[PDB]
Amino acid sequence: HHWGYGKHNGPEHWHKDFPIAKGERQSPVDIDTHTAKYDPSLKPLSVSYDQATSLRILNNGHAFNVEFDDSQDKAVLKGGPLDGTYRLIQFHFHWGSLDGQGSEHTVDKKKYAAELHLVHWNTKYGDVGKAVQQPDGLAVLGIFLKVGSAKPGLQKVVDVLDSIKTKGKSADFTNFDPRGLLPESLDYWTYPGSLTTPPLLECVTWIVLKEPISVSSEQVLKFRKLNFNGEGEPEELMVDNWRPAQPLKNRQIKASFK
Ligand SMILES: NS(=O)(=O)c1ccc(C(=O)NCc2ccc(F)cc2)cc1
Ligand SMILES: NS(=O)(=O)c1ccc(C(=O)NCc2ccc(F)cc2)cc1
Ligand SMILES: [Hg+2]
Ligand SMILES: [Zn+2]
Numbered sequence: 001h002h003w004g005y006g007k008h009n010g011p012e013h014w015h016k017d018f019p020i021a022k023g024e025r026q027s028p029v030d031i032d033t034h035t036a037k038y039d040p041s042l043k044p045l046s047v048s049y050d051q052a053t054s055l056r057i058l059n060n061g062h063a064f065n066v067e068f069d070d071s072q073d074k075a076v077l078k079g080g081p082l083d084g085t086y087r088l089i090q091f092h093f094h095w096g097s098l099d100g101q102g103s104e105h106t107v108d109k110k111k112y113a114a115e116l117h118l119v120h121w122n123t124k125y126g127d128v129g130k131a132v133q134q135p136d137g138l139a140v141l142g143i144f145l146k147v148g149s150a151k152p153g154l155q156k157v158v159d160v161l162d163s164i165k166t167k168g169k170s171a172d173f174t175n176f177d178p179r180g181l182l183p184e185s186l187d188y189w190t191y192p193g194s195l196t197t198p199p200l201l202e203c204v205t206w207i208v209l210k211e212p213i214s215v216s217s218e219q220v221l222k223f224r225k226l227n228f229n230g231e232g233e234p235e236e237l238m239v240d241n242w243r244p245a246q247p248l249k250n251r252q253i254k255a256s257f258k
Contacts, residue, residue, distance in 0.1 A: 025202045026246040027193030028104035039254040046079035058170035063092045081190045086120035086139045097239035114145040137203040144212035153180020167230040183211035187257040
């Protein structure tokens with residue numbers, strides 16, 4: 001009746017309404033470190049988030065999104081495997097009901113507690129709607145989260161969750177700095193893929209960072225307290241909102257380091 005991550009409308013049923021689910025460049029995938037190709041022509045990543053304007057945070061029934069003002073080149077992504085300028089529009093996480101699961105991409109079959117997705121679109125296309133009709137329209141920066149010590153920069157996000165507990169709720173969320181969520185190194189793996197939720201459009205250049213960020217048990221616990229349902233509907237905790245690794249098919253994963 002609408003997709004989800006439940007037994008009856010989860011990832012394994014998505015192909016019925018979204019045929020592209022069995023496509024050739026679907027994400028996420030397992031990153032086999034020994035088979036990825038060191039490509040020395042890949043340039044270093046350029047992250048310019050100093051003029052970033054966050055606006056709102058909302059629970060959309062599948063995850064929570066922090067939205068940004070993308071009317072101008074305030075927060076961009078360039079370099080690496082990219083051609084042109086990509087504007088940050090929003091970021092979200094995927095996580096599990098337990099620490100040994102949660103990420104979408106895996107490294108040598110290893111799953112992390114959660115995964116962060118910073119979503120950007122190609123400025124050459126004018127608006128996001130046009131970008132989703134192109135093979136090089138989007139660029140998502142993936143960052144793994146492992147459980148250990150607390151991440152200061154994440155607490156601001158964790159505190160506001162109580163006000164967006166149920167589907168459809170949103171809270172004002174200004175002056176948040178996304179730079180606080182970055183690992184120390186910007187080394188990455190890259191490959192051509194797709195959105196990991198319906199409509200699953202194959203319009204994404206994936207950039208997965210090698211170095212994960214550390215978050216505390218308490219911080220991750222608060223993500224698990226959110227709800228998939230709207231207010232007044234029976235309660236279903238928001239956990240395990242991640243799609244299983246897909247076949248690599250005819251693709252090659254290139255690394256920016258050896
Ligand atoms: N400029 S703003 O802060 O108000 C803004 C923020 C987020 C979004 C969004 O998440 N929708 C994405 C989206 C919508 C349609 C598509 F075809 C592709 C992506 C849209 C506008
Ligand atoms: N987990 S992920 O990074 O892959 C991801 C990023 C963005 C979106 C999205 O904007 N959906 C809206 C949307 C609606 C209609 C469209 F035609 C296109 C996008 C979905 C998944
Ligand atoms: Hg596309
Ligand atoms: Zn995502």
